[PDB]
Design a protein around this ligand. Structure first.
Ligand SMILES: Nc1ncnc2c1ncn2[C@@H]1O[C@H](COP(=O)(O)OP(=O)(O)NP(=O)(O)O)[C@@H](O)[C@H]1O
Ligand SMILES: CN[C@@H]1[C@H](O)[C@H](NC)[C@H]2O[C@]3(O)[C@H](O[C@@H]2[C@H]1O)O[C@H](C)CC3(O)O
Ligand SMILES: [Mg+2]
Ligand SMILES: [Mg+2]
Length: 258
């Protein structure tokens, strides 16, 4: 997608306001929209803070409505994948690890939502990472700056969430659908574990590529190119090369000490 993003952004915030205006504290645009800039496959990352949990019916109304504002990756030249994370004030302030996520919407749910599966509130270790990103780079579309609203996420909580995330990826079906992002996410986790910082997918990829034995450099170079829209994503082609990359990078992450 190469289209100006302000139209779809205003549609998505209109849906959020329509359901949540009376309990809304903040809407923050974050992720690559604010840090590095949207690339052809980039989603729109929104973080919504409410003062009270949602009624079940409000969860379903909002999830259904958000799906109508969103397009499956590669199915639209004008609409990006939309991602909305809702946190309840008293669940995330004061900061505790791990924290409860009230709601998340994203295109990975499309099938579920169309079958009437509405994901309920859960522990989400990923909030340690999302709130660290949002506090550093975001736009308050409404309410206070992320920096002021959210407590700092301790670096030990960041470090633990980065290492725990690696439990998701052990064998090839665990990354079957999502080969480019698992590769770029491994590079970002490795980068963040050594640096304590967060980098866009291409910056983390180039950092990783410097620090890899030459055998592992090709898979991350292909992922970095596909992220920038420069080359095709043919990472599923080279299945064995992918799993060796994953095992190699996980081992290198595991070596990084706190
Ligand atoms: N070290 C890390 N840095 C960044 N994101 C990370 C890291 N570790 C795990 N993640 C998760 O990776 C996901 C990235 O969100 P996503 O919207 O795909 O990223 P982005 O920076 O906006 N880039 P993109 O949408 O591809 O342009 C989130 O769930 C993050 O918390
Ligand atoms: C909260 N961050 C998101 C989640 O990690 C999510 N998967 C549970 C990610 O899924 C993705 O990698 C990508 O980025 C999504 C992330 O932005 O979002 C695409 C629509 C689907 C995907 O599978 O390609
Ligand atoms: Mg994004
Ligand atoms: Mg996202």
């Amino acid at each position: 997608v190469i289209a100006e993003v302000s139209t779809q952004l205003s549609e998505v915030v209109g849906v959020i306001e329509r359901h949540l205006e009376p309990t809304l504290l903040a809407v923050h645009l974050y992720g690559s929209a604010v840090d590095g800039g949207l690339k052809p496959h980039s989603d729109i990352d929104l973080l919504v803070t409410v003062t009270v949990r949602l009624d079940e019916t409000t969860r379903r109304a909002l999830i259904n409505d958000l799906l109508e504002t969103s397009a499956s990756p590669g199915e639209s030249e004008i609409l990006r994948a939309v991602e909305v994370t809702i946190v309840v004030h008293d669940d995330i302030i004061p900061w505790r690890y791990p924290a409860k996520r009230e709601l998340q919407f994203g295109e990975w749910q499309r099938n579920d939502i169309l079958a009437g599966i509405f994901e309920p509130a859960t522990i989400d270790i990923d909030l340690a990472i999302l709130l660290t990103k949002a506090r550093e780079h975001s736009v308050a579309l409404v309410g206070p700056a992320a920096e002021e609203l959210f407590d700092p996420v301790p670096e030990q909580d960041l470090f633990e969430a980065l290492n725990e995330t690696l439990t998701l990826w052990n064998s090839p079906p665990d990354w079957a659908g999502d080969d480019r992002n698992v590769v770029l996410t491994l590079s970002r986790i490795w980068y963040s574990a050594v640096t304590g910082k967060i980098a866009p997918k291409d910056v983390a990829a180039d950092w990783a590529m410097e620090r890899l034995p030459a055998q592992y450099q090709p898979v991350i170079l292909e992922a970095r190119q596909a992220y920038l829209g420069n080359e095709e994503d043919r990472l599923a082609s080279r299945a064995d090369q992918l799993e060796e990359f994953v095992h190699y990078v996980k081992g290198e992450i595991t070596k990084v000490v706190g």
